[PDB]
Amino acid sequence: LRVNEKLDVENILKDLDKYTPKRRGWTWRQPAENLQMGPFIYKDASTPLENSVALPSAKYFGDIDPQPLPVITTEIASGRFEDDIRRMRMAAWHGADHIMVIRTAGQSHYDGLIEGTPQGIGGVPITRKQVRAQRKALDLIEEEVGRPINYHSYVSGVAGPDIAVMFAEEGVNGAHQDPQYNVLYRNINMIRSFIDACESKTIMAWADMAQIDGAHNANATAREAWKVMPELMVQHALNSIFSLKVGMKKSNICLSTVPPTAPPAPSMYLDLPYAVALREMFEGYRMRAQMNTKYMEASTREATVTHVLNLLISKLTRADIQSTITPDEGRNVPWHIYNIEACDTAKQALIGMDGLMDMVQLKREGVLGDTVRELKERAVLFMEEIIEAGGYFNAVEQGFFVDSGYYPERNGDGIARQINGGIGAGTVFERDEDYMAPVTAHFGYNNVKQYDEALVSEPSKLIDGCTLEVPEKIVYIDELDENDNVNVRMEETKEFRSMIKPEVEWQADGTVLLTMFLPTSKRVAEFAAIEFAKKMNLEEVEVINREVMQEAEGTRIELKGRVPFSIDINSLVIPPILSEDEIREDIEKTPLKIVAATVGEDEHSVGLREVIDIKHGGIEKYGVEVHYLGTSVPVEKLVDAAIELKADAILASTIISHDDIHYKNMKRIHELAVEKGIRDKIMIGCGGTQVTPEVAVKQGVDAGFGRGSKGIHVATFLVKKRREMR
Amino acid sequence: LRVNEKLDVENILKDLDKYTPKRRGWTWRQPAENLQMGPFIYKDASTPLENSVALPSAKYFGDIDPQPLPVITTEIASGRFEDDIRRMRMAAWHGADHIMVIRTAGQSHYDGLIEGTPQGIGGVPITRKQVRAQRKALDLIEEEVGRPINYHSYVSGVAGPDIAVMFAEEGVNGAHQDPQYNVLYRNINMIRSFIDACESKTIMAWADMAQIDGAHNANATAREAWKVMPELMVQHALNSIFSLKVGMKKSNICLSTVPPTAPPAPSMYLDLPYAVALREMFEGYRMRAQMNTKYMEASTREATVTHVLNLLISKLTRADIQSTITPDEGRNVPWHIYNIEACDTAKQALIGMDGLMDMVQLKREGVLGDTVRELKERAVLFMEEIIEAGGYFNAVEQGFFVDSGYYPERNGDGIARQINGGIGAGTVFERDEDYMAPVTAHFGYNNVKQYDEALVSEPSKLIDGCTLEVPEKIVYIDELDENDNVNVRMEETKEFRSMIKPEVEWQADGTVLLTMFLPTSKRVAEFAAIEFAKKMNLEEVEVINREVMQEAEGTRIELKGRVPFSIDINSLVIPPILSEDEIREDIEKTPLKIVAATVGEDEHSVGLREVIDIKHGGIEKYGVEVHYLGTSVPVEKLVDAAIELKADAILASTIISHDDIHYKNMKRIHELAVEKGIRDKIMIGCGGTQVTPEVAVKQGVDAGFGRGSKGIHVATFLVKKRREMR
Amino acid sequence: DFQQRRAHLANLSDEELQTRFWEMAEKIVDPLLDLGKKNTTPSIERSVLLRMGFSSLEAKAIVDKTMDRGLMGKGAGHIVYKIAKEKNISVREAGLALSEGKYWDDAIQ
Amino acid sequence: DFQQRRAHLANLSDEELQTRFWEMAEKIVDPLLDLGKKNTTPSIERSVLLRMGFSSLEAKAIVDKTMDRGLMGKGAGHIVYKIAKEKNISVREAGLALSEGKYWDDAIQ
Numbered sequence A, B: 001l002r003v004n005e006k007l008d009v010e011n012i013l014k015d016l017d018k019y020t021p022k023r024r025g026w027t028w029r030q031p032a033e034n035l036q037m038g039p040f041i042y043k044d045a046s047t048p049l050e051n052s053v054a055l056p057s058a059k060y061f062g063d064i065d066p067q068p069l070p071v072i073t074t075e076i077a078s079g080r081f082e083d084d085i086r087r088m089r090m091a092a093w094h095g096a097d098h099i100m101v102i103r104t105a106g107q108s109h110y111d112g113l114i115e116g117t118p119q120g121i122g123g124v125p126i127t128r129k130q131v132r133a134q135r136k137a138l139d140l141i142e143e144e145v146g147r148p149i150n151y152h153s154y155v156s157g158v159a160g161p162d163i164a165v166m167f168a169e170e171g172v173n174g175a176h177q178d179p180q181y182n183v184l185y186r187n188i189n190m191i192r193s194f195i196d197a198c199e200s201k202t203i204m205a206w207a208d209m210a211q212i213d214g215a216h217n218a219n220a221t222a223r224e225a226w227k228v229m230p231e232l233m234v235q236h237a238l239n240s241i242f243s244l245k246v247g248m249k250k251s252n253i254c255l256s257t258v259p260p261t262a263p264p265a266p267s268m269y270l271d272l273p274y275a276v277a278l279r280e281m282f283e284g285y286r287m288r289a290q291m292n293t294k295y296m297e298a299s300t301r302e303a304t305v306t307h308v309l310n311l312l313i314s315k316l317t318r319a320d321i322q323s324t325i326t327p328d329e330g331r332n333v334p335w336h337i338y339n340i341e342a343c344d345t346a347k348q349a350l351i352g353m354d355g356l357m358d359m360v361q362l363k364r365e366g367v368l369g370d371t372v373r374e375l376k377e378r379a380v381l382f383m384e385e386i387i388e389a390g391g392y393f394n395a396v397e398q399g400f401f402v403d404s405g406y407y408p409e410r411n412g413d414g415i416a417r418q419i420n421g422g423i424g425a426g427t428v429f430e431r432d433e434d435y436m437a438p439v440t441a442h443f444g445y446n447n448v449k450q451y452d453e454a455l456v457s458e459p460s461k462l463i464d465g466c467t468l469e470v471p472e473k474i475v476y477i478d479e480l481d482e483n484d485n486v487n488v489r490m491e492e493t494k495e496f497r498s499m500i501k502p503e504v505e506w507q508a509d510g511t512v513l514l515t516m517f518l519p520t521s522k523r524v525a526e527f528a529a530i531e532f533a534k535k536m537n538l539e540e541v542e543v544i545n546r547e548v549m550q551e552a553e554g555t556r557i558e559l560k561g562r563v564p565f566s567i568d569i570n571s572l573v574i575p576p577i578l579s580e581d582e583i584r585e586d587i588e589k590t591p592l593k594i595v596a597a598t599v600g601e602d603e604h605s606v607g608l609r610e611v612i613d614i615k616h617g618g619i620e621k622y623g624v625e626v627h628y629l630g631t632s633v634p635v636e637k638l639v640d641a642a643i644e645l646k647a648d649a650i651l652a653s654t655i656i657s658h659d660d661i662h663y664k665n666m667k668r669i670h671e672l673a674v675e676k677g678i679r680d681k682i683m684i685g686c687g688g689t690q691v692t693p694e695v696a697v698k699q700g701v702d703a704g705f706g707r708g709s710k711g712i713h714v715a716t717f718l719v720k721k722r723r724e725m726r
Numbered sequence C, D: 001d002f003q004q005r006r007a008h009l010a011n012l013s014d015e016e017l018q019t020r021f022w023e024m025a026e027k028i029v030d031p032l033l034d035l036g037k038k039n040t041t042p043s044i045e046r047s048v049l050l051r052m053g054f055s056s057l058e059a060k061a062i063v064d065k066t067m068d069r070g071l072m073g074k075g076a077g078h079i080v081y082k083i084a085k086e087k088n089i090s091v092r093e094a095g096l097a098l099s100e101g102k103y104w105d106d107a108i109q
């Protein structure tokens, strides 16, 4: 890639049959102890990127772009992976090193792999082709920013083993896998689920993938999420110990932990003890913090503020991975700019808190401690009852999970799954004593000794290597649907690869956001805003946020809509500045002295003082020596002072403009300067409310300054003119 | 006020000569110990408002609107105080109880009170009439929300005593006053400034006003704000002890303290020891925390995140007043909606942090403690040098202040003022032996004894009371300018008080905000964006934010622009609701059983499961008992199963649409349901990718469901139809 | 309620409480891991065939026929292997044939 | 350099350091408070007049004339009060008259 050139998706899509992953496995960020960037030293930073976009306010500190410790996630999955690849490059420059691709709605129900590139709904259809394309693109992107990026998706559903094999082959770095999710939230048969999971997790472990669990789902389905903590702990524990015993490394087993509440609940006070208790009980495992979605609305500001609180919870405890949620998530399907907002927010808050735990600590003894112990107890109690009920399967049939109670309280409204029901019920088959599977990473009973004692540890030897050892053996399928694919899809927008239109997720989708305040009640304000938007030529108009300023005084409305036309870039008329530092330096090296006054019979003093006083950025700020004569100063007094004081410039104010006395007085200043033989060695700037710069100059003065003039404009003129004169 | 009627600004402006303030002095919030609101108990809350607008996400918690303990400020001063009054009511409902009115630019230089209602620039021209109007409007507003509101402005400048008298008379509750502000930042003569301040502060103390000092100005003028901490401490100290010695109550003396830095600096780490050191050194005084403006850009997200970190600094230490900055402050003059954002942010974050310090504490030994000590020592050395230099005036003359060095480092670039220079130089007069002032709240030498030894304690008795005792003695002036006043401005917009248009600050100003992403480089994107706004009929278009997503891939552009047309409310077509709660309660009262299947030869199973599975809000989440028969289910088998299980409803899915088989199958279901004579007892919903609700009903089924269907839609139909049948 | 349920835990140290938490989690999952050692499913067999060099389309065909013949207990991959050695042909040729309904009488033999 | 400047503060307790900080602040501002006791300014005098019940316009006129006549040291409000007494008129009348130019000879006298 070249930084000034767009990613060539058309090119990435070529020869995908020949693509092989450059890397395998998960990567953590590398701490950079006591890192110096610009003026500052950082205690909790990781290795800087080679290429990146710094925070807007970094421009005040030399454009440094410090990176925090945790892996930072962003979720990108629009239904069109070919558009998403472009957003990935954007997100990567803003610091995301974990790209999570949510699958097309209900891929969990596909009984096997799908192939090709059909359009997705609420996510991307995961297929070998799509995976290769995105992993290949990520190979280029990660080389550009100079830090490995983790590609990540979902192994959930009835075809876990199938997907796991494909992910393992194609170099997917991490994935979600939790048998409990299949059962509780997708009603997949529980026997099928847990048997499949043994194989799935074995393949993931072979591939050194990070695993994220399914616990966040209990937050979503809780009636009051501040009551679901005991169940969360059980769910975390069951998937963790099951994964460990299958053979995964603890260091790859990640708990998906979302702080349960948001304001106006006392959310830190409710969530912090849970965060502490979890990380004490699960010492040795990884924590994947994720942000709030449950208690979220259509205001991006409110979302952002809650997210910073989420980040504070991580900082006060621990996050190995910090996932993010786009602040528009409760308002619309995520837009490019809001993935970038979320990346900026996580980076900004965490760097802001750099070294916080050197200055702050938990009061682990006290109310915090009391609640932490209680939470652990309720969780142990929950486990006790599961065994008392005769094990996991019985507990599930009895509706122990997804109950709205605060355990041990049980409201009896949980989700009960049948041991003999759900998707795939009756598809479990006993292995006979001569069962055999000639492949690597197989979990269950495997009689290879019937063919050869020696090959027991390498069943794949029986066939001279499986696809895990021999990538050559993988069968690549391109497309199966002639009409529903990425090629047909690209063809539709090839016109946009000198014409441009806005977009939010897909090339040329034309969508823009409109924000306004209307001084009326909210219902009327909504329909009125729709009408204003149509009058602005927008199509497909939808109000997506409404906030009451006050019931009668007014309402804020945000709408989205499509711009039904395009702009030819060639048609644009684009025209072809001294810094404050440059101005200051020019004056420090060569002192600059001015005399200033409001002249004539004019007693208006403020305007002149406003471009002089340091308060609102007057020329004082840059070290100009100002000799101020005051107001109602006769024009000849001003000129006489300039000569006497050896001034480099005269600055005069004329506020009163009756009968053009303002221009007349400028003319008179010029004439008096000429008459006294100094006009060629002095600068003369004149300003005032009714002063047009161009007309001022015609009076003979060097520069005119009107409404809204600032010290910077004046100092710039003085610096530049003195140079032109030399 | 009535909650559903707009403030009547014209009626407010009536009879101002007859207005007297309802009350006097500063009010603090009322603590509400262990306050229960909804499900929660709060540790650090104050009394709830009688009327308010809760956070958007409060809807999940019964719309509770918890109020934090600190007084919360918002700054409202557009130049038109008559528009601003409407904004004060909005902000009051969002929780602001401190309204700060910045003055029109350079009012510090008015050598006396001004009168009337001229248009301001960058602030409101402060006058008796304008103050009366706003204090009158706030009386109405504070009764409405049910909590007193502090009105606040500035006593700064050469006419401090004049303004102080007017403020005391008119019930202004708080004000900025700091003699160092006048000298350092406005170049007012230092002898006059300090002499005047004795009088100004004496009048403010009489009026029981809170005072805020001017130290935040030192942040702004510092080259690097993380070096200015020793100067801030000195400035705070000099004003604080001067104020106390004059006779002001320590509990009315507020330090204006802004955390010095922002990300990407390690801002908490740099700012927290300073925050701690100040509160330790200045124990007994009040802390007015204010948010970052120095290290801020045009991004509202970035501003908001930094502001949450500022708020955390307050929570970890102490803020008696928490002032706020609008997140648009670095982008444009503040809009209605961004004052409200700021109020919501302060409230949201503080509430989120409720009880924080019961679970977290400062590590007061270690690095924090060492840095705290070092900062106090630097401040001490600074004071020592001022004394060594021969005192305050000398130190200012020698440029000790506004120097870019980290004290004791001195770079020699500070602002030197002359003892005999600046505005008002030579206006100081020695008091003679017989000097007298027959008024209350006079600070200096006053020979009353020459007339009546008994009246020394109350000089106003010489004239039977001054305006501070006898308000009818106040000379009220309405207007001096016949063309530049509020009456004239109001007349200009008579038309909008059933036509409506958007505004950001002034009635019908027509401004709106447009946000978009363009897949090109920043400069081309900016100009292209401008052209899009033109085609949307927007005038006076300005680009106000630009953010790089990636140099080549795209740019975020935000623009403001004016709509040239209005809308008549009367011409709007406005049409004239069942919750999750009701739906669920409905089903738990009367159990609802359904039979579901994908019918015909169809194997597409996902869609039907999407509206059943709890994962994405399927009807499972509402307690509906579902008997699922899988896919390729012949219709009769479905109908037969409906009867053999005594079901309340049949839900069929038809995805394959080729040859209208989906509609054909719906018809079949109806007929079979009819021909077995149960059509009037059972409910029948059918769904599919190519299903149109309308066309489905034409087949004889009860409801059709197409793209985007959710469980909520389905359960809603089921409860409402069931209700209908009986 | 909770106050009574927890009685028997009150004297455990945090260390003992954690041990008890984990020892119980292990008991609960132990039978699930056993089911996994002793059984298989269409997805497992399909994923075995994927690893052996077959497509998703071919794996599906082979596993469906294997289920039809009631031979899942033998392993779908095992069937392809045995048939390859028996007829001395390659794995893919054996697998392709099976997916098209050939050699199943031999497998049953 | 800071390390050398600070040497004499190193063994002070926090309490000593804090009291010393405030002790110096108080030494610094004392001369400035003394100035406020013993002197006046045009804004202070206008503020006295405002409190005696004159408008901003009337106050400016009276103080400008006070300064003209060299009488600031007596107090502009005092001047208004003294004239009102000698002429047996209201404070308001004496002030309005002075603000228009009457009684200044008498005042001087």
Ligand code: B12
Residues within 6 Å of the ligand: A601, A602, A603, A604, A605, A606, A607, A608, A610, A611, A651, A652, A653, A654, A655, A656, A657, A658, A685, A686, A687, A688, A689, A690, A705, A706, A707, A708, A709, A710, A714, B105, B106, B109, B110, B111, B114, B118, B119, B121, B483, B484
């Ligand atoms: C407040 C005010 C006063 C104050 C002035 C206080 C003071 N110390 O300055 C008092 C209250 C003193 C005053 C008095 C009068 N004024 Co008047 N004043 C105003 C008012 C409302 C504000 C001007 C102001 O301060 N603007 C704020 C500053 C920041 O803006 P600015 O002056 O435009 O300066 C900016 C630019 O012009 C530029 N700039 C200005 N000067 C210079 C110089 C240089 C070198 C540079 C580089 C830039 C520059 O930079 C600044 C941007 O930051 C205006 C109305 C208005 N809205 O403009 C009238 C107004 C100017 N004054 C007016 C009048 C009539 C009067 C009086 C005659 C009224 C009377 N008494 O009968 C008296 C005359 C006094 C006299 N002898 O001169 C009229 C003038 C009409 C005309 N076309 O001539 C105005 C326009 C009001 C009106 N609409 O009639 N008034």
Ligand code: B12
Residues within 6 Å of the ligand: A105, A106, A109, A110, A111, A114, A118, A119, A121, A483, A484, B601, B602, B603, B604, B605, B606, B607, B608, B610, B611, B651, B652, B653, B654, B655, B656, B657, B658, B685, B686, B687, B688, B689, B690, B705, B706, B707, B708, B709, B710, B714
């Ligand atoms: C993935 C897929 C498959 C999968 C299905 C996997 C599974 N277990 O379901 C497999 C199974 C891979 C498949 C097979 C075939 N399918 Co196909 N399938 C698709 C695809 C791409 C996804 C659809 C999907 O799941 N959408 C996501 C869900 C959430 O949306 P939904 O189904 O519309 O459901 C929502 C609403 O409709 C509504 N809803 C739906 N049903 C119901 C019922 C009720 C009661 C209610 C209240 C609501 C409701 O709620 C849901 C959530 O909002 C679509 C193309 C497409 N984009 O739609 C075709 C598509 C429907 N299938 C198609 C074809 C051609 C086939 C095949 C014939 C191809 C072939 N092999 O030759 C085979 C035949 C299968 C068969 N024997 O029936 C064509 C249909 C042709 C037509 N016009 O009828 C489609 C349209 C693709 C295309 N453009 O050609 N394909």
Ligand SMILES: C[C@H]1O[C@@H](n2cnc3c(N)ncnc32)[C@H](O)[C@@H]1O
Residues within 6 Å of the ligand: A114, A115, A116, A118, A480, A481, A482, A484
């Ligand atoms: C509806 C869907 O089924 C698929 N599918 C499987 N086999 C074929 C085939 N031979 N032709 C078209 N689509 C097929 C696709 O992968 C598609 O998206």
Ligand SMILES: C[C@H]1O[C@@H](n2cnc3c(N)ncnc32)[C@H](O)[C@@H]1O
Residues within 6 Å of the ligand: B114, B115, B116, B118, B480, B481, B482, B484
């Ligand atoms: C320019 C300004 O001067 C003022 N001002 C004071 N007296 C008068 C007057 N007699 N006529 C017009 N403006 C006057 C206003 O307060 C105004 O804003």
Ligand SMILES: *Cc1c(COP(=O)(O)O)cnc(C)c1O
Residues within 6 Å of the ligand: A103, A104, A105, A106, A107, A108, A109, A154, A156, A157, A176, A177, A178, A181, A186, A213, A214, A217, B615
């Ligand atoms: C939300 C979620 C999914 C969703 O994917 P589907 O294919 O639609 O089921 C999958 N797995 C996990 C763990 C999830 O949390």
Ligand SMILES: *Cc1c(COP(=O)(O)O)cnc(C)c1O
Residues within 6 Å of the ligand: A615, B103, B104, B105, B106, B107, B108, B109, B154, B156, B157, B176, B177, B178, B181, B186, B213, B214, B217
């Ligand atoms: C910014 C500021 C002002 C500004 O008001 P002006 O009349 O323009 O000087 C005044 N006082 C203080 C303390 C300020 O911080």
